[PDB]
Amino acid sequence: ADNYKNVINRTGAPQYMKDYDYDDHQRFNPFFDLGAWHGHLLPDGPNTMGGFPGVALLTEEYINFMASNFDRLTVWQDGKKVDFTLEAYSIPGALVQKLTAKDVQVEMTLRFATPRTSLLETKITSNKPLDLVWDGELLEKLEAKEGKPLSDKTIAGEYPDYQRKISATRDGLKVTFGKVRATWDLLTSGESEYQVHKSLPVQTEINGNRFTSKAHINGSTTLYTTYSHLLTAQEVSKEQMQIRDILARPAFYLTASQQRWEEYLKKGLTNPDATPEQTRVAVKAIETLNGNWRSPGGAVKFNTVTPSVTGRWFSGNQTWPWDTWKQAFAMAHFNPDIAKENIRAVFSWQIQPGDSVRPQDVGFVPDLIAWNLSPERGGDGGNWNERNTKPSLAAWSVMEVYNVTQDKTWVAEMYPKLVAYHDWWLRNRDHNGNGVPEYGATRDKAHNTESGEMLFTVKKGDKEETQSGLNNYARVVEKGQYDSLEIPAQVAASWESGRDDAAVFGFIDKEQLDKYVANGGKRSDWTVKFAENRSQDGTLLGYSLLQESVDQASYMYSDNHYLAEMATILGKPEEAKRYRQLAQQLADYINTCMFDPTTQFYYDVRIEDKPLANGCAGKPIVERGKGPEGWSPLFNGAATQANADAVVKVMLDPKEFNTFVPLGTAALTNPAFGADIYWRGRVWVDQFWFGLKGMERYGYRDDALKLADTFFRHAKGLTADGPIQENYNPLTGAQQGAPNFSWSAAHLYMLYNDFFRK
Amino acid sequence: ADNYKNVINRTGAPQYMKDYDYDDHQRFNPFFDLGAWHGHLLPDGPNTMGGFPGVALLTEEYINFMASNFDRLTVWQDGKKVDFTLEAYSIPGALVQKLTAKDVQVEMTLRFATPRTSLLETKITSNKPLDLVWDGELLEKLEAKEGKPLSDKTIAGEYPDYQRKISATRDGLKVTFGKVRATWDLLTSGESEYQVHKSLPVQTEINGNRFTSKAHINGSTTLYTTYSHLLTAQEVSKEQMQIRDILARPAFYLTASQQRWEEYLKKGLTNPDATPEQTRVAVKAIETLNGNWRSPGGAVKFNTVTPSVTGRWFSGNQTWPWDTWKQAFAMAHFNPDIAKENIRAVFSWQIQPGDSVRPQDVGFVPDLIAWNLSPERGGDGGNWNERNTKPSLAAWSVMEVYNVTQDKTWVAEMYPKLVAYHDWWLRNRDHNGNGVPEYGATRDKAHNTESGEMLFTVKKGDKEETQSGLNNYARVVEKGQYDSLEIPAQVAASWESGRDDAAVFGFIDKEQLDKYVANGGKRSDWTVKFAENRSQDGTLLGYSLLQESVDQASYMYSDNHYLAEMATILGKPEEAKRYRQLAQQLADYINTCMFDPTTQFYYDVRIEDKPLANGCAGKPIVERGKGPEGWSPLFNGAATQANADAVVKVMLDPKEFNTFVPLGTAALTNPAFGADIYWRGRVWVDQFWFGLKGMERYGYRDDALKLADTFFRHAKGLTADGPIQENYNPLTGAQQGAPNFSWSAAHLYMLYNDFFRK
Ligand SMILES: [Ca+2]
């Protein structure tokens, strides 16, 4: 671990609870481990030297800073303060700082000991007795963006019930917090606490929101301190015995952390052809993913991994299916225990028969689960969402854990859950019943009235009229006399696709649409019709875009392929043959229906009023341009060799996808292309890797290696010490997105192992 | 009428269907009369000379231009066009233009003949034979704002089904229109037509959207032409016999129009002490109101008057109660037949027992009625609104008609309808049941769910959350952890008050609010709580602001006061005694509860959690500042002399309301004051006149006369030829609002009658 110092800049001295960057994400990168609910930063100068500033608290679903300096050590001799020089750095699994002075030296090492407690070793070297002083102060200011205050609002003024208080204890001190149910900002139980326990007797003076503690030592000695963020009264009670254990045998906990991390690196850094710089990227990915891992909390009874511990809306233990599949696929190779847990977390809330909220969605996996359940399920959580799910690469992910562990009991455990999810797609996301799914949405309070009528708002100029009923919707779409049409259910469908702004789903701005029509196209070519899915008895099951997506179909091909393998592993030959048959049928549909012989590429197809003579639901939507979904059949292995050869030529074309940073979310030729548009131009690491793997699968590994090299040389900040983000401008390589982004980290790790090299 | 040429500039050559000003109103002022559904403009120069350009069609609920030049005459002799010099002007009730040449002259007079037809007299004087040519062309461009096109969209491109078509006929030509149901822009039945009939045979050639008609005359001759905009097949059939009668006795129709207008002027201009300039303003008001008068159309079976025939959202026959009361009050003095009809139109849709939509609203008068009924009543109209009503000055208006006509049958006719409306307020707009109504909203699809749960949206940052249920609402308001709360029913309540952005109703911008709090005030001081009103058996009747408005209480005083007067006139002494008692109780409440001695003014009171010891629902809301409602008790006669004396001192204070243009919608001292804010500073003619009348009622006629003079000398454009608008900046006198605004015209006329003097 010592070979990788400061892979990510973890220094910082927060002055606001919400010390955000331009996109509302915490602008510092705290160290979290063991799935804990609090993190720490490194001192950035004389003002924070002696402690690890920026205590970051994960308040159920958000990350909020508690203080800048807190338990910062200063040393005194003969009544005079010792003058230290600072050296601070992070390593995978720990924060370290060394203070050097003539007669006194201090070496502090901070590692995590339990899912709720971090351990600080303060090794003091001194030839004479000394007086120690620790100080701390809770933050007062509420919000800032890029170092500048957004307002003069204070934490206490904004949250009168927070009522933070510092109290002395028999072996340290604790901060207590009142109950705050700020749905989108701060969530506490009224029983949460931040505790500080120490190995020596200390003298504490509390002055409101600041404190000063003193202690006298006789000479060189090593003290131990535990820091714990406990979210409930039960957690507080349970942790006490652990804290006692930690202080009694601190060496065991330091060693356990050290060995655990040596193992992550040993198991994960498996590419001997990688350069030191490329290996460092892999380590950054490992640090990022492990930092985003959260232990069980609230409604989530399993360890999980979120998109970003520092993200505005991705913190706490908020978990999404899409992210989980890629996260677990990567983590299977270095932290398999958590990879498995993350998958379990998502499936733990899979809809069961007789569900109290949506019995018509058996097998469904929620878009978002978190500490707090939605009001529909008895909680007060505002994030918990069941309006949609995400593209399914669940089987792919489960199989990867097996590839590494060869644990058949893991397959036995997950198989029935994967089958239930697989079956749900076919019942609730197959409007025309041809076995090829569509992205869509569920029946929900945000999508329809009490009686089941689909809600929608028509916008024209400054007029906004809300209506309901599929019939009325049909009439409105026909006339097309509106500037825009907002359908909550269709918005949810865009979320279900994983690319809510992609051109293929009808997203194009006025400027682009005008040019399109000016070139001979019709604005109606961009209208994606919507439909409801009802059972044979008339029961509303959900909704579907009247369009079948080629990536969706390819993921379904993958699902069947892996389910067939699992069935074989479990000794279920007949089920294996069925899935093998389902896979073949999907491959044939993908190749016959979604491949356009003329443009030599794959596209989505509309579910037209009547199917084509060949049985296809509709023709490929070539007019909306080419996108990454085009190589989904290659990545998933549904493509024929000839069609793959054709797609690869387009991918390598500099006028299409072979840009400064290759394989973006829309070809340069796409009418809705935008170099800065998230899903209509920007390059995402997952789609990029899918592309290279698809290329490799059909015999083009040499070309994939070339594109990977281009990516390594052009993707901005790759070899720097900044946090991992979400995407890149394809022309400039400039980064955008939330810092410490999990799925980017996951695919960067995959790239390191599969395509990066000297 | 000849003494008033060009009172309003009616010249113009529209080049767009929507030739709008900066606020989306048609930038020209077409001549409309007899309640017809089409209007004409005067030629602006050589380009339009020979015809009356800018055919304006009232397409059910909107005003849309059809063409610039249409049926424009040019005269030819020996193949050479006769060169004419132009003279054109409008007079009350007619448009006139004269073309002068050496040996040829043409005199054209255009007046309206029926509620669907205008008549043009073309008198040609010539010493030699001549070849006549009439030409026209339909507009092509869709929209522009003050001359600058808003896009390159064409009419046909925007409305593919409009399919305008010109066809030749044996006696002229016609333009037919396809069926267009563009709710917010253009409404046609698919059977509407614009017909041109002439007294002399002409050969018409059609070329796409343009036409040319030719005829040869042997010398001086006078021809007659009729122009008719017919909106339905039935109207088309019915008008034919009218056109025949018109062409058989053209001079009789011209005379009838002339006489009708001489009568309007004789009846209306009765102030012998007015200056020529002040009289001209009265004439402009008369022309404006008569132009906004519409004959029966669609669902409205009575003649009515709209806020503005040229308004973006006030055209067609859209009618509101608030406007109607003031419109009829003024029109009683010159066009009483239509004043009565306007009142009848509003009450024709008053809710009756057993109503199919809102049986719980018997007596209720809709906020907006128009050609097309709402979908809830079987139509496809989007304007028809029953989410709320308007302040009630219905009795006051009905009484003015009686004061002029002395027709007791009129009072007998309206009395029961007024009584029903009176009773509705007490049942559905008195949340705490103390007999003092509040402004509120009805049960509506836009306000609540099918089960009757009140809808509302909570906004925090970029997060929006639509919830339902009064209990949930109460909680949200208690926590106050939001930036804004959007409640459809409360929005409708602001519409019912007639001042949707008034300070007293909680409307204040961030800057102003931050300043208020910085000065020691509480932000919650501007929070107006809301409540539902339910009957004994639990039926939802509607909603009420938890606030009793002083103007509302004063209008209820007025209602009872005038009903008592009517009961006496109708010989119902016991009913009179009851209304007198109710009026008395309201006056006592207004004087005891809403008057604040300290600031010498009246204010709304909150309906506090518990009433005050004296029985008042709450303390006057003095902290939100003073507004025009403060003198409502004076205008309506509810104030005691002592309280009136106090209020008048504040009104005449230049640091409060006695500004450049006096008596605006918010005192200069109001914390939410804004010189350009419609309801928080701007001066409206109705509130101004209410103030002068209130002043006069309590002995201050001298001061009211002075303010009237100040208004006449300071209100911008008053003596110019521009159309009447909505309001004025109190500091500069600058105008804003829809052109040809009815209620401003109504009150300007009242000012002419009551206070304007030499
Ligand atoms: Ca399908």
Ligand SMILES: [Ca+2]
């Ligand atoms: Ca009341």
